Each structure stands twice: as C-alpha cells, then as structure tokens.
Amino acid sequence: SMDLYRQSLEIISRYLREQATGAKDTKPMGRSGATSRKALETLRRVGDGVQRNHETAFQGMLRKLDIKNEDDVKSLSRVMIHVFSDGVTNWGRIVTLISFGAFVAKHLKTINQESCIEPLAESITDVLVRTKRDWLVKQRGWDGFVEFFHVEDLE
Numbered sequence: 707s708m709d710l711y712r713q714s715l716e717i718i719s720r721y722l723r724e725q726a727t728g729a730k731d732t733k734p735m736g737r738s739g740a741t742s743r744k745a746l747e748t749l750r751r752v753g754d755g756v757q758r759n760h761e762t763a764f765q766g767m768l769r770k771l772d773i774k775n776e777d778d779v780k781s782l783s784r785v786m787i788h789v790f791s792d793g794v795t796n797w798g799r800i801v802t803l804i805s806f807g808a809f810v811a812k813h814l815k816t817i818n819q820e821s822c823i824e825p826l827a828e829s830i831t832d833v834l835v836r837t838k839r840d841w842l843v844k845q846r847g848w849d850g851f852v853e854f855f856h857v858e859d860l861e
C-alpha cells in the first residue's frame with residue numbers, strides 16, 4: 707500500500723532522525739497527520755524505554771552486525787528479514803525493530819555515516835510494510851499501534 711508505506715516512513719524516519727540529532731522536526735506531517743503525530747508520541751515513550759531496558763541485547767546485536775560503512779547498511783535489509791520474518795508477529799516486535807533502528811541510527815552518527823540514516827529508515831519501513839502488510843491492515847495500522855500501547859484508561 708502506497709499510503710501505508712508513506713505514513714510508516716514519515717513516522718519511522720522522524721524517530722530515527724531526532725534520536726540521532728537530538729532535535730525534533732517542525733515540518734508538518736502529510737496525509738493522516740493526526741494519527742502520525744500520536745504514533746510518533748507513542749514511539750518516543752515506548753521506544754526510548756525499549757532502548758533502556760534492552761541496552762545489553764542492543765549493544766550485543768550492534769557488535770555482531772559490525773556496521774562500518776554504507777555497503778554494510780545496504781546488507782542490513784537481509785539480516786532484518788532473517789530475524790523479523792522468523793516467528794510470531796505482534797506490536798512488541800514492531801516497536802523492537804524500530805527502536806533498534808534508532809539505536810543503530812545513533813551509532814551511524816558516531817562513525818560519520820549520518821547519510822545512511824534515511825536509507826536505514828526506508829529499509830526498516832520496506833521490511834515492515836512488505837512482510838506485514840495484511841497483519842498491519844487487520845490491526846488498523848498506526849491507529850492500532852497507538853491503541854495497543856494506550857493503557858492509562860483501562861480503569
């Protein structure tokens with residue numbers, strides 16, 4: 707889906723870019739902006755927690771990947787599908803994919819590979835929308851993501 711890819715890329719690239727730079731993007735959101743803004747807010751809350759709680763595993767995975775240049779970033783796509791396409795599909799695994807994406811984006815800045823952040827964001831969005839299309843549609847896309855992590859109103 708064109709609209710699902712577009713919205714997912716906007717959310718994912720905004721999170722990875724602001725995690726690496728330390729500064730939010732003031733540029734307005736495109737189509738379905740209200741959902742995208744709520745999704746980015748949820749991603750910041752949940753995603754920052756995932757990076758803190760799974761720091762040892764994220765450091766371990768980053769070391770195994772041994773990312774040194776732009777060719778290594780292009781090959782990340784096949785490692786992503788090997789790990790992500792094996793087993794169950796849920797929002798927890800999706801937030802892990804994106805959160806590790808931000809952890810990798812920060813490392814990319816450190817090694818002067820900031821130009822690889824946007825192709826990284828596109829690769830993550832590609833793996834997500836291409837492999838989990840049907841599941842994402844059944845779960846109401848990004849509205850479903852926001853609702854899933856919304857627990858303060860359970861009573």
Ligand SMILES: Cc1ccccc1-c1cccc2c(CCCOc3cccc4ccccc34)c(C(=O)O)n(CCN3CCOCC3)c12
Pocket residue numbers: 760763764767771782785786789790798799802803804806807810830
């Ligand atoms: C949290 C955890 C705990 C214990 C060990 C590893 C992890 C762990 C670490 C990192 C990411 C994930 C994912 C996201 C998908 C891969 O993301 C990428 C892979 C490769 C490159 C990527 C690049 C950019 C963005 C995502 C990339 C999952 C997941 O799919 O849940 N896990 C758990 C992995 N399981 C462990 C048991 O063995 C079965 C697999 C991950």
